[PDB]
Design a protein around this nucleic acid. Structure first.
Ligand SMILES: [Mg+2]
Ligand code: NA
Ligand code: NA
Length: 323
DNA sequence: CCGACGTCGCATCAGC
DNA sequence: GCTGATGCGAG
DNA sequence: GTCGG
C-alpha cells in the first residue's frame, strides 16, 4: 500500500470510470493492469518515467503519475469525482445486475441513489431487485471459516441427492485464500458427458429445500447463479452470499476445475506454456496443435494432473497457483 | 497505423 | 410467437 | 490505454 497507494487508487478510480461512465471496457482493463503491476513494485515510485518501465504502464499513465507526484492530485479525477451525473452512474453499477447501461438509463431519468431505486421497484428487473436487497451483504467478504461451513453444506446436500455426483468448490477458496468474494461450485455426474435427464435442478432444489439457497439470479440446464446463507446460531444472522453452481460434463470436469481454480494470471501463463509445448488449453479441453496450428481431438483427462502431464509440468498445488 | 484486449450462459429486449 | 442482439456478470 | 504485428 502506502508505498505507491496514492497511485494505485488513482488508477483504480480511473479504471472504474472507464468501465461505468465511458463504457470503455478496454481502458478499464488497461488501468487495472497498470494498477496491479505498480502494486507489486516494491519501491516508492519517484517519477512517471520510472513507472513506464513496467509492463502495462504507457505514456499517458506516466503523465498522470508525474502530475500526481508533483501536485498530489490529478485534475481530471477531481473533476469527475465532483460530477453529479457521473459519480451517480459509477455508484449505481455497484448494484449487482446494474451495469453501465442500466446505470446510464437510470441517472438519465432522475434515479440516482439507493433510495431512488428503493422508490422504483417497478423499473428494476428481477436480478436488480435482489441486487438492491443485498447491496450491503454483497460488498462484504466471505471469511474462509464461513466458506468451509458453506462447503460442508454444499458437499453434504449434493451427495444426499445422489452419491455419484462430484462437487468441487473452486475459485480463490481452493487456492487457500483467507477470504472469498462469492462461492463457485463445479458439479458433474457420470451420466453427463459431451456425448450425452434435471441434474442441475435437483441440486438447487435440495439446497433450497434445506434453506441454504434463498434467491435465484438465473438458472438453466448448466449454470446457476443465486444467493445463499448459513443458518443462525440467537447470534446475529450471517450475510447473504453470492453462489454460482455450474454443471460440467465429466470429460471436461478437470479442465473446468483447473480453469475455475485460476488465478487469472496463473491460467494466462499455463496457456502460454502449453502453447510452445504444442498444446492448446481452454476451460473445456486440452487439445494438441498439429504442425501448422490445426488443433486435433481433445485428449482425455481424468484428473487435474493429466493436464499437467501433457505439457510437462509438475502438478502444482492449488496453494501455489498465484501466477 | 491499427486491431486484440475470451467467450459464454441466461434473462430480457428489439425486430420481425 | 420466434429468433437474434444486447446486457450482465463471470476467467 | 498499452502493446505489438
Ligand atoms: Mg447411492
Ligand atoms: Na511501457
Ligand atoms: Na453491477
Amino acid at each position: 500500500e502506502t508505498l505507491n497507494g496514492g497511485i494505485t487508487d488513482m488508477l483504480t478510480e480511473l479504471a472504474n470510470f472507464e468501465k461505468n461512465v465511458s463504457q470503455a471496457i478496454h481502458k478499464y482493463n488497461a488501468y487495472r493492469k497498470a494498477a496491479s503491476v505498480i502494486a507489486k513494485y516494491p519501491h516508492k515510485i519517484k517519477s512517471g518515467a520510472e513507472a513506464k518501465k513496467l509492463p502495462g504502464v504507457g505514456t499517458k499513465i506516466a503523465e498522470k503519475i508525474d502530475e500526481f507526484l508533483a501536485t498530489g492530485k490529478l485534475r481530471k479525477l477531481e473533476k469527475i469525482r465532483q460530477d453529479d451525473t457521473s459519480s451517480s452512474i459509477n455508484f449505481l453499477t455497484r448494484v449487482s445486475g446494474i451495469g453501465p447501461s442500466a446505470a446510464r438509463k437510470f441517472v438519465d431519468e432522475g434515479i440516482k441513489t439507493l433510495e431512488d431505486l428503493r422508490k422504483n421497484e417497478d423499473k428494476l428487473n428481477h436480478h436488480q431487485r435482489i441486487g438492491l436487497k443485498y447491496f450491503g451483504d454483497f460488498e462484504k467478504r466471505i471469511p474462509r471459516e464461513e466458506m468451509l461451513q458453506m462447503q460442508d453444506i454444499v458437499l453434504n446436500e449434493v451427495k444426499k441427492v445422489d452419491s455419484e455426483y462430484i462437487a468441487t468448490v473452486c475459485g480463490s477458496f481452493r487456492r487457500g485464500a483467507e477470504s472469498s468474494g462469492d462461492m463457485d461450485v463445479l458439479l458433474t455426474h457420470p451420466s453427463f458427458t459431451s456425448e450425452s435427464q434435471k441434474l442441475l435442478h435437483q441440486v438447487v432444489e435440495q439446497l433450497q429445500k434445506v434453506h441454504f439457497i434463498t434467491d435465484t439470479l438465473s438458472k438453466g440446464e448448466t449454470k446457476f447463479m443465486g444467493v445463499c446463507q448459513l443458518p443462525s446460531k440467537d447470534e446475529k444472522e450471517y450475510p447473504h452470499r453470492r453462489i454460482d453452481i455450474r454443471l460440467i460434463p465429466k470429460d471436461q470436469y478437470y479442465c473446468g476445475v483447473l480453469y475455475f481454480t485460476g488465478s487469472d494470471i496463473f491460467n494466462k501463463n499455463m496457456r502460454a506454456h502449453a502453447l510452445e509445448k504444442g498444446f492448446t488449453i481452454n476451460e473445456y479441453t486440452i487439445r494438441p496443435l498439429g504442425v501448422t496450428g490445426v488443433a486435433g481431438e481433445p485428449l482425455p483427462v481424468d484428473s487435474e494432473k493429466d493436464i499437467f502431464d501433457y505439457i510437462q509440468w509438475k502438478y502444482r498445488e492449488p496453494k501455489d497457483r498465484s501466477e
